[PDB]
Amino acid sequence: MMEAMVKYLAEKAGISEVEAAEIVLKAVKISGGDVVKSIELVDLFIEILNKGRE
Amino acid sequence: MMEAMVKYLAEKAGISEVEAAEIVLKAVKISGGDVVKSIELVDLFIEILNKGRE
Amino acid sequence: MMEAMVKYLAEKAGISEVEAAEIVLKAVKISGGDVVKSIELVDLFIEILNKGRE
Amino acid sequence: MMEAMVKYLAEKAGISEVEAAEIVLKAVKISGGDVVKSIELVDLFIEILNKGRE
Amino acid sequence: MMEAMVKYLAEKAGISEVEAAEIVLKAVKISGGDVVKSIELVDLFIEILNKGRE
Amino acid sequence: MMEAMVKYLAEKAGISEVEAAEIVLKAVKISGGDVVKSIELVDLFIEILNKGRE
Amino acid sequence: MMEAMVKYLAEKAGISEVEAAEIVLKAVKISGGDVVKSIELVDLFIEILNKGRE
Amino acid sequence: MMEAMVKYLAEKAGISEVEAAEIVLKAVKISGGDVVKSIELVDLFIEILNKGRE
Amino acid sequence: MMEAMVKYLAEKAGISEVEAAEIVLKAVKISGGDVVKSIELVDLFIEILNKGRE
Amino acid sequence: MMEAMVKYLAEKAGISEVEAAEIVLKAVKISGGDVVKSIELVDLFIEILNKGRE
Amino acid sequence: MMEAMVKYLAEKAGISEVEAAEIVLKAVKISGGDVVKSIELVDLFIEILNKGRE
Amino acid sequence: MMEAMVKYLAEKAGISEVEAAEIVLKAVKISGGDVVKSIELVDLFIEILNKGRE
Amino acid sequence: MMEAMVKYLAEKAGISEVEAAEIVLKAVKISGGDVVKSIELVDLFIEILNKGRE
Amino acid sequence: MMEAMVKYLAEKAGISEVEAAEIVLKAVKISGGDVVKSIELVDLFIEILNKGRE
Amino acid sequence: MMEAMVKYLAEKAGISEVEAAEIVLKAVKISGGDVVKSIELVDLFIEILNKGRE
Amino acid sequence: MMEAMVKYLAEKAGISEVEAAEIVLKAVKISGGDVVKSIELVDLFIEILNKGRE
Amino acid sequence: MMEAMVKYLAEKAGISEVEAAEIVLKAVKISGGDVVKSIELVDLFIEILNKGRE
Amino acid sequence: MMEAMVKYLAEKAGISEVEAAEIVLKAVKISGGDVVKSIELVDLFIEILNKGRE
Amino acid sequence: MMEAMVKYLAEKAGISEVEAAEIVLKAVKISGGDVVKSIELVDLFIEILNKGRE
Amino acid sequence: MMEAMVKYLAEKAGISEVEAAEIVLKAVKISGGDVVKSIELVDLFIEILNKGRE
Amino acid sequence: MMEAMVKYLAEKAGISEVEAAEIVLKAVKISGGDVVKSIELVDLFIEILNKGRE
Amino acid sequence: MMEAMVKYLAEKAGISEVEAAEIVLKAVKISGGDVVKSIELVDLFIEILNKGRE
Amino acid sequence: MMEAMVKYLAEKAGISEVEAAEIVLKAVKISGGDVVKSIELVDLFIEILNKGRE
Amino acid sequence: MMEAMVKYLAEKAGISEVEAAEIVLKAVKISGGDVVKSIELVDLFIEILNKGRE
Amino acid sequence: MMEAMVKYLAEKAGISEVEAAEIVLKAVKISGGDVVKSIELVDLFIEILNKGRE
Amino acid sequence: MMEAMVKYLAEKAGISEVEAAEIVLKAVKISGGDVVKSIELVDLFIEILNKGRE
Amino acid sequence: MMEAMVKYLAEKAGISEVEAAEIVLKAVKISGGDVVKSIELVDLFIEILNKGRE
Amino acid sequence: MMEAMVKYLAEKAGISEVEAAEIVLKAVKISGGDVVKSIELVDLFIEILNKGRE
Amino acid sequence: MMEAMVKYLAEKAGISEVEAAEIVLKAVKISGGDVVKSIELVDLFIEILNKGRE
Amino acid sequence: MMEAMVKYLAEKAGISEVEAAEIVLKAVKISGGDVVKSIELVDLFIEILNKGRE
Amino acid sequence: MMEAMVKYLAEKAGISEVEAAEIVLKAVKISGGDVVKSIELVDLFIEILNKGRE
Amino acid sequence: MMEAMVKYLAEKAGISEVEAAEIVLKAVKISGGDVVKSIELVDLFIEILNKGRE
Amino acid sequence: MMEAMVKYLAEKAGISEVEAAEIVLKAVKISGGDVVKSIELVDLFIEILNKGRE
Amino acid sequence: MMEAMVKYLAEKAGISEVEAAEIVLKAVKISGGDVVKSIELVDLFIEILNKGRE
Amino acid sequence: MMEAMVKYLAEKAGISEVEAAEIVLKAVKISGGDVVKSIELVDLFIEILNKGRE
Amino acid sequence: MMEAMVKYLAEKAGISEVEAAEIVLKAVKISGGDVVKSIELVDLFIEILNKGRE
Amino acid sequence: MMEAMVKYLAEKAGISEVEAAEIVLKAVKISGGDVVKSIELVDLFIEILNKGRE
Asked: How far is A49 from chain B (nearest CA, A)?
């Protein structure tokens, strides 16, 4: 699960592997371990982490 | 609930009222309407939306 | 909840806040009072209410 | 929700904010706190409160 | 049930019997067919339909 | 059902039909819509409403 | 319901409208509000109320 | 149970033993065999059977 | 229960007390001990026992 | 079911076909539609309907 | 069951067997297939079908 | 709906108010107090009560 | 609970009392005896019954 | 059901229709109204009723 | 059940009794053995079987 | 409980202590011992017992 | 229990021990092993097995 | 039920009435008394009983 | 489902496709999505929509 | 669901689209909306509707 | 399981094994897949399939 | 079901078939597949989609 | 319970005991009869009733 | 919810916004968060807070 | 029961009583103590034990 | 499973395949289709079928 | 869904529209109305219906 | 179960044993392992697989 | 259900009607017949089917 | 709900609006979203936040 | 199932078909009829039956 | 079941009967005895067993 | 799970690793996290993503 | 439990032992005795108690 | 438990203690730990392990 | 989970990484996502994929 | 139980009795006391404990 999310976020947000792992762990913690909610939340993170620096 | 979150996020992240409203609506949607999860998500957004632009 | 939607809809559609209040009340009735469905439904209005005039 | 109804009723019936607040509180009390029934009931007042004076 | 309500409302509000029938039908429809709620709602109608024209 | 009580009360207490209608509606609300309790209450009013004026 | 019984009883027993209303209320009270038992009981009164005087 | 009702009714209503037996059987049959309801109903007959002739 | 039925049947059918007791015991046994069914069946016997000889 | 009972009763009691049909309908109605109880009652009628005329 | 009802009704009402079959089918259809209700209803028709022409 | 049925039956079948009231009470009693079955059954009486005399 | 609808429909559609009674009986029968559904359906008829002739 | 059994037994045992009806009624009563047990028991009677005389 | 349906259909459709038996057996099989559905379906056949040839 | 109601009613209606005790006992008996319903009903009596003499 | 039945049947029907044993085994099998049903059924055989040979 | 099957099978297979009754009783026994299964099984016999001789 | 009703209604009432579609949508909404109720209700419209203009 | 049956029925029976639509609507109503029963029932109509004219 | 029946049926009825396979498949389908009922039903076919040709 | 909505929306809103199909698919998705909610929601679009351009 | 509250409130708030009885009855009515909630409310009134005048 | 009560109470009682906020928070806390009870209780405070100073 | 089977089997198979006792004990053991199954199984042995030697 | 038993029984008892098939089908039927009981029962036959001839 | 399957099957198998409609109706009936099984089954036909002719 | 189907299908369709085995395995897999559905489905293939090549 | 998606998919992806029908059937089958999931999945195909060729 | 606490806390503790918003969000999060617990907790902060600096 | 095991065991152990059939029947009986346990046991026998003779 | 798979697998994969029997027994053991899963596994082995050697 | 799917899709579709991760995340999100449905969806995606560019 | 919290709070916040005991008792009382919530709340107090003075 | 089996098997089969221990462990594992099944299975091995070498 | 299986299978079977991924995905799909069954099935694949090429 | 494993493990691994006892106690503890799991686990050790030292 998470390994795909880590590289996916690193590519789509340009962040490093270690930062993506931290953000993905935050998402997994908040989601309660749900796979679907984690992916939704990582996509929302990809939105926020882009439009917030621009 | 959300009105407190909107101003809270706008102050803690420097974004406008309407942008904070959009982000808070995203958080409420993902949370499934839970008040606690919405506040946790808004705090995580305050973390991300700061460290991602610096 | 609804107060954020009224401003959120008014800004994103350009309508007056009194007209936004009416449309948001329509969404809440159809949604059965669900917060999540109301936000999904109000988002759909922003699509219809923009491409429907263009 | 009630704040939207109070302004929604005040505009559509021409009554003051405090008079609208009183009537909306009456609707919420009879409705048993249900949001949907309160909006349906407030809509009915806008009918009665208009044709009842004309 | 309703016939007592119709004449009661017509007397206490001064409206015609056909108009009272319409308003009582609205009350019964919103009330979900409950007898008690219909009477409370008709009393609220008697309040509104008097103080809104004065 | 209530129409029988209205005329029944009007005759046995000497009150007008509109005053009987009001009192019968009071009885139905307190009774919770029960037919039996409404008749018991209306019977009790006929006692109070007679010995209370003498 | 009861209005049909009142006229039905008054015609078949020859009693006055108000006397029929009183007896029908007695039947409804004992019956527990049941429609069927009230009609059976009112029919039973028509027997007693006729042969009881002849 | 019924034998006490038969003589009680015969004495109070002045009817014969066999007529009282018939009326008490009617009361028991319509009451569903309940003792209390049978006594209430036989009491009601004594009222009807008196004013029915006077 | 049965003693009223015995005299009732004996008077209404002209049979002796002991024969009425036998028929009423038959009715009670076949009825399953139900009081109401026993009375219905004893009434049914009075019809059969009359037209069956005439 | 009943057709066998009708001929059986007519033969064993000597009554006509239509009279047997009426008595069998009475038995079926009072039995609650049970097949066994109907046969028991029809047997019981054959006793009553014979010794009742002798 | 129905064949006994058909001839019973034809004899007691004087109608033809095919007309009695139609009426008995109507009774069975309305009754929901219940045997007891069907017989009660066919008896009710015999009253209506007689006094309705006289 | 019994008052509506009484007028409805009286007009369609041409019978008097009290005769219609009697038949409607029969329909309600045998129907078990159900509104739907009473209307279905009263409609059937209008058929029987017409072709039964023609 | 019904029987206000008859005059309401007669006035709002211009039909006679007997025709309104028939249509209201149709609505009540098809509605399953529900009060609210009957009122909604009678409201729908007032639409069809007006634009259907224009 | 039973009519087929009556002719079947009469043919296979040589007894008259009325005797076959009596035996089939005995079988149905003792079987508890079950169709299958009644047929099995009538089959057993055809054995006993043949070898019992031979 | 079915014997009344067979003759009813044969008369109302003019078909032979053996053909009516086949059609009634088809209806009973499709109906799942329900008496009411069988009668409704046989009524429907009488429509199809008449207008289908004309 | 009741002692407060007795003096409250005596003061607010002007009746004596023993009459107030009787009326309060009637209210408690009708209410089924419920404290809230007893207070509501005693309040209703104060209305009836005042306007009933004026 | 069966040994008593075998002797009981053999004496009352005159059959041999082995023939009685066979018939009693038939009764026990059809009865489902019930003791009471077996005795009722064996008694039924004693009737059939006697009158069937006379 | 079975009488229609007996004649139906006798006609469609050419067998006598008594043979058809036996086969239909076999079908009813195997079917467990189910009406639909009995009709399906009797239809299957009409196939076997025809092609089995040709 | 609905497409058949739309053409079915359009032909039987002579209305246009879009007017039939509107009325059929009204029927489906009130019916609660039930297929059978929608067809019964659409048939009811065909009666009203014809005699209402004549 | 319905459209395939309408064309399927129209071709196999030769009837028009509107006549097929009417018959298919009848099948769906009786079936209770069941898809499978409707196809079984429409298939049966193709038999009746062909051999019923030839 | 079925292979034993196919050979068993073929030998005892003299039919070809392909015809036996068809009949055994018919038996299994009607039986609902039950092993016991299939064997009982196949035994019945052996009776029918023999006496049906002789 | 949706085909009626697509044409219904296209006519009432003037949009093309493909744009109507898109909006109707949006309504069905949000509604959770409910038929009634989809029609309510499509009706709301006709309001928004008209006043939103005027 | 209430008598202690009445004097307690009168002493602590300085109001007359008849006014304290009214306020305590209001508290008991709102509390739903709960003893603890009534005491909490009476304590709350003492705060409001003191600072509300000062 | 509470904001409407705060303005509603402040205007009706004349107290400051912060004093109204405190009293409304007391009402919500003691009410258990129920919306209806809070409105009932705030209404009662308006009564106490007026006559408590007058 | 077993003693009847032992003699029953011994006579019908010609085996000694001690050998019959052994076989009957085998049947009872396999049957699980069921009386009916033991009799069915002992009957099967009488077949096997006869044709098995012939 | 049964095919193994058929060969297993044929070898161990010397009987033919068709005779083994018949006996194995008897075992399966009595066993209720249980595999284990069929094997136990078939083993018992191999004992009986050997010592029963020796 | 069926209309898509009918054209889907007709194209992929080359059969006519009405022949495809017949086969798709067979699939839906066997499937028990399940959408998924119908599509799986229709795909299975496309294999058989192609390789079965080649 | 399947082995009978494989030979049954091969003979009735003329396909090879291995081709029949493949198709029967397809039927069993899609049928969910049900014996009845597999036989119904294999019969349908015999229809498709014959008319599909002609 | 399906038809709107086929046109919707064909237009938005430019594929033929039959190719769209195939893909939509894939979506419906894999979705388990759910309406909402089918629309979500068909939307995903429109994404994949566009960027997959670009 | 929270907005009243924010101003209530800000006034009673003297902290800024944004600082009050932060603390109230802490209270709501710990409380699990409970309204009553949040108010109790915010009251405790007003104590700690005052005596903690003095 | 078992036929595969019999050949499977015979080949892998070198025993004859009848000896393999006996051992496989032992495995099936002791396994309780479970297919999986039977295969495990037969595998274990192949181990024991091979190494046990060396 | 398994015998069809053994030949089916042997033909498609070209392996011997005993090798196919071993592999099919492996599939049935893993499947847990499920028929459908066993066929899926055997199909998969045919894929692996072909491309695994090529 | 997903990492195997990502490389599998990348190889079988030729897309890049990051694009395959996105498509696999879409599949997992739609599937609801189910592993089986995700693999089915990925295979469907391979089919679509191959044939849509060709 | 609490003793560790008391010293922890006293050290981290710098308050006295008795003040820490009071605050910890407040936390335990509000928390409902939960250990986890008490620790979370005491941690929150350390934040408030620090920034509340600085 | 197992130690008795190990020596019991070793003596009765002549194998060594360690070979007996291995086989007994196999029996216990297959049995699922059941004591009874293990003894039955160890007994079965003593048969196989003896006749398997002789 | 699956990544260990992929390398394990590739090593123990000699196949490439992508081929092992495909086979492991097949195993996971058939297994229903179970971890244990997937490993058992991959071991069976390792057996088959080796011995089938030799 | 364990003593067999200790000797079994000691022989098959060459370890001492006390070393075997220690390892077997480890297996029993991890297994949760399950007998079967302990034997599977002890067998797994015999593999590891043999190949692991080479």
From this structure: 6
